[PDB]
Design a protein around this ligand. Structure first.
Ligand SMILES: [Cl-]
Ligand SMILES: [Mg+2]
Ligand SMILES: [Mg+2]
Length: 225
């Protein structure tokens, strides 16, 4: 009984609302390559959701056999941010406006759930999707102690929305994000908007898997039945 119970649609930001992940992946890949370290474009997608500190540390441990210092982390994250900002501004993901408009027309409330503290993108949510979201019904890095894959961001969204888990659905693109939605006990739809094998998203706990936001939008009515 999904139509009867659903009140809210909890959208992830990077790779769901904004097509930002090719740029995050490229910046991570390239910053590491300039330092002689191997972080593939695909692997950068696997780590989507982790702090910059954790990603850097995973690479340092695997390739250099030690942890990074705080000054190594701060420098590399700064350089990553420089590269990302040098690329074009991330456009809306195709299909994201259409699905937002559709769920809104069905009387559902869109929410954003992200572990991001990236103000350049956070501020653009209002600019790029006017009337879709409300800051009281958003979860960002500023709201949470632990990000994805911990369920905290999604449980916080349920709390901010005054919702029970069965009154929400999560839309996620990343395996750590899917894990967070699933561990929050919420029906989680994976949208495989990157280069990863869809099996990684199923293994993370996805209830349904679609290859793109537009394909999800096209199939939304048949989910609701
Ligand atoms: Cl690569
Ligand atoms: Mg994402
Ligand atoms: Mg796809």
């Amino acid at each position: 009984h999904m139509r009867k119970k659903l009140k809210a649609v909890l959208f992830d930001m990077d790779g769901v609302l904004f097509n930002s992940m090719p740029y995050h992946s490229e910046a991570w890949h390239q910053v590491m390559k300039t330092h002689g370290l191997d972080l593939s474009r695909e692997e950068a997608y696997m780590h989507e959701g982790r702090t910059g500190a954790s990603t850097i540390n995973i690479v340092f441990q695997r390739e250099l056999g030690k942890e990074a210092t705080q000054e190594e982390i701060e420098s590399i994250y700064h350089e990553k941010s420089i590269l990302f900002n040098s690329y074009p501004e991330a456009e809306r993901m195709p299909g994201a406006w259409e699905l937002l408009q559709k769920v809104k027309s069905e009387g559902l409330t869109p929410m954003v759930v992200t572990g991001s503290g990236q103000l350049s993108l956070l501020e653009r949510l209002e600019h790029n999707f006017p009337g879709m979201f409300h800051k009281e019904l958003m979860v960002t890095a500023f709201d949470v102690k632990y990000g994805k894959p911990n369920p905290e961001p999604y449980l916080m969204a349920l709390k901010k929305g005054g919702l029970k888990a069965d009154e929400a659905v999560v839309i996620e693109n990343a395996p750590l994000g899917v894990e967070a939605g699933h561990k929050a006990g919420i029906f989680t739809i994976a949208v495989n908007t990157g280069p990863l094998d869809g099996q990684v998203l199923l293994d993370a706990g996805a209830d349904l898997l679609f290859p793109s936001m537009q394909t999800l939008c096209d199939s939304w009515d048949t989910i609701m039945l």
